[model samples]
Target chain A: DEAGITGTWYNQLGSTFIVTAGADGALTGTYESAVGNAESRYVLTGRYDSAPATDGSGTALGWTVAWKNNYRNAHSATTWSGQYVGGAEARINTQWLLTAGTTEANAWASTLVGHDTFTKVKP
Target chain B: RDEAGITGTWYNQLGSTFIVTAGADGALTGTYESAVGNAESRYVLTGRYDSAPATDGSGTALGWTVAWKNNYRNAHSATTWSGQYVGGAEARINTQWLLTAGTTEANAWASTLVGHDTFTKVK
Candidate 1:
């Protein structure tokens, strides 16, 4: 509830996912992306946790649980980690990084292969 | 004890808190945000509470072992958490966290006693 990331989230592309943060913090919901040929849609879910930021400080920052679905990167190694920095009172500015090539950490070093940014969609 | 009834946000003391949510399959999952001297510390955990006899000889007790990984000291290590529903609105918990798990970086702290704590429903 304090994070305010629940509800429908969008990106620059046509990708979309609806996040419903329960009182328990289990964000179980649905997602649709353009990765699987015909624009696949599937159930999306992950836990809200923390991960050490790539910034050499070793200061852990907020991150979404690593997730997987065949449409994007079938191997379950792809991770979409992000953090909300600062912005307006009505919306949160979220910087997202899509990393691959690791079972956990950002082993690859860059958000180059896949990366995007988005803000909360308020009605 | 009703399995579905165990879903909610809980707090113990000023720094310890646990939030649990039940899935469609009656599985338990949530996050724990601990009061830390560093940045905001958070971790993810998931498991289920079962019907068992309470240690206090109560009619029914909850049995669960939550597996977790620290985001900061994290090393792909899973800290084992064991807890029980003493009666109502409370749970007794302890961690196999501080390594003593052996030479692995993850389990390096297992040798230390991480201490035990309790949580009460906040909602």
Candidate 2:
């Protein structure tokens, strides 16, 4: 199933999602933020559910990245969870939650929640 | 056999043109010809797409990036658009885009632009 998700992906924000699926379902990738210099690459790791559902929707995916050491917006760690919808145009629909970092002026809103749809770039 | 997919040319309401080629590995590479602004030349585009064959391929998540090489003065910028492609009797790509220009972080709030458009295959 790794073949289904191993490739390049892009989100709405113009961010680049590069993933490499390990043999044991481990997922490793680099996320380049488009909002920044388009060069800040963040490390991410997660696991993929090889066993999919009958409707081909149960292949869950979860990944996280810590931006504490980021050169620009170094404040929080974010986690994204979603499902893999495979077909001619495979995609990952994910919801993300970010923990507040010291850089945020409003700590109350620091724990942010958002959604991102990642479309495969290179299969 | 020929099939219906987002591997052709598309145009938005503004008359901007996008020529896309979808790779087997989910990679999308293309060219964008703007009808406005930097309409002098065609920009390069790179992105991704994902689909589910089980659903008859009705919905596909797709996205791409273009660096508007309008390298003149303050107009230098790049745009990334992410959207969904609807395939059936009607084919269209509805997308939201974020355009960023300039280098100053503070100016980011003012220079950043967001908008949406739907693209229909023309070629």
Candidate 3:
């Protein structure tokens, strides 16, 4: 999983995405807008797996990311669920969802609320 | 309110959640994410809470200019996101997508709001 997303990816807005990895695809990462200032940030945790068709992610190298709202103290969570489509060299098409609400009803609730595709970058 | 940090979750009529958190540095951070099921439509918001009307001020709200960017799209990424919270539970957010990322997000900097959506404070 380190080879998957354990480096850096940048958004044009100058936000830097720093991903760190553990053993066997258990990973953590941050989207740092403060740049040189590292203390302030958000966290993305889930699993990166190249496995037996888990996460319903099919037979492809894949990842699931849950964005823990750091500033909001995890009041709400969003997601980027991606499968490494074999079409491009550094491309991942991720499904986006705004996972909000306190109750089981009346929220986005992982209902495929949006789409996000990213191109990798050098650290 | 100084005692009440803007930390919690608010939702619009359709449940577009804005997870607001006041950071240790007194900086504000949030997410303006719609569960509309599209990656291009989600936003990550940030700013600072200068002051609120009062900790127990009736009809009071937190004040700040929250900025946001599209989670994935560059064109819709940079924004001058202004927000006003009423009664610590509701807020009015106005956004202006930019032709460019600017420190001074001027009015003329706003575009047609091409892919924008709206949210109401959760009841």
Candidate 4:
């Protein structure tokens, strides 16, 4: 929740792709996917806005995960947004629902594996 | 010679020896020795005498220069290749030259010679 703090979103796979937050509340990154693979890399560019929540934790920022495919069709669009439940080891619950499309039907159409507790780097 | 005085200048060609003294006209005179072989080629001496000459003058033995022709047949051996070829030869090799002189002349002459050479192996 600290102002002027930028956090990194890392892909746990061998690719180790990273998405970084910008000053305008947008997430942008590139993925180096195999050229001929059905799940080729797509430029991940989306904005972050507040998400609704209960238990008095207030609203937290949410981000859209969109990808433009090689066929000029945006497929596997999803949302990966969460909150920071304060602590040295913070907790984040990302809810990403994959949209059905030609590329999504051919490729893995499962949602992103959410994390309950994401570690926060110390300043 | 009158002890050649402590402050007199002398000059001699390579391999020559001479005695230094002041002439009647206040000019320098170098006396050469006839017994000295053809090695003695030239000589010159200069000094200022404030008083009259001594009844019996004695020549002081200063320094002498020597030169002679000598034959040189330098035959260097090729670098001996040592060490096993594990994967490839070692990257580099170095050598140092040491000079030992028995006299001041030999030491001065040796000091005038200095050199170094480096080469890289291609194969």
Task: Judging by TM-score against the true structure, name the best candidate.
Answer: 2
Pitting candidate 1 against candidate 3, the one with the higher TM-score is 3
Q: Using lDDT, give the best candidate's number.
A: 2
Q: What are the iRMS values of all candidates? A: 17.5, 9.6, 10.1, 37.7
Which 10 consecutive positions of candidate 3 chain B have the poorest summed lDDT? B107-116
Cα lDDT tens digits for candidate 2, B70-110: 43323487788988888756688899886667657534324
Interface RMSD, Å, model 4 = 37.7
True contacts kept of each: 0.00, 0.00, 0.00, 0.00
- RMSD values for the candidates in order, in angstroms, are 18.4, 14.3, 18.0, 35.0
Q: How high is the DockQ of candidate 2?
A: 0.02
Runs of candidate 3 with Cα error greater than 4 angstroms are A11-15, A32-40, A51-70, A85-88, A102-112, B1-123
Worst 10 residues of 3 chain A by lDDT: A106-115
Ranking by TM-score: 2, 3, 1, 4
Task: List, in order, the clash count of every candidate structure.
Answer: 8, 14, 12, 0
lDDT of each: 0.47, 0.73, 0.47, 0.35
Residue A53 lDDT in model 4? Answer: 52
The digit string of per-residue lDDT tens for model 1 on B15-54 reads: 5577777565646788866553222466776776654334
Give the Cα RMSD of candidate 4: 35.0
> What lDDT tens digits, residue by residue, belong to model 3 across residues B8-120?
77665455677777765556676666544333465667676545345454432233332344546543324343444444344444332221223343322122222222334
lDDT of 3 at A51: 48
Angstrom error at residue A104, model 3: 7.0
Q: What share of the true interface contacts does candidate 2 keep?
A: 0.00
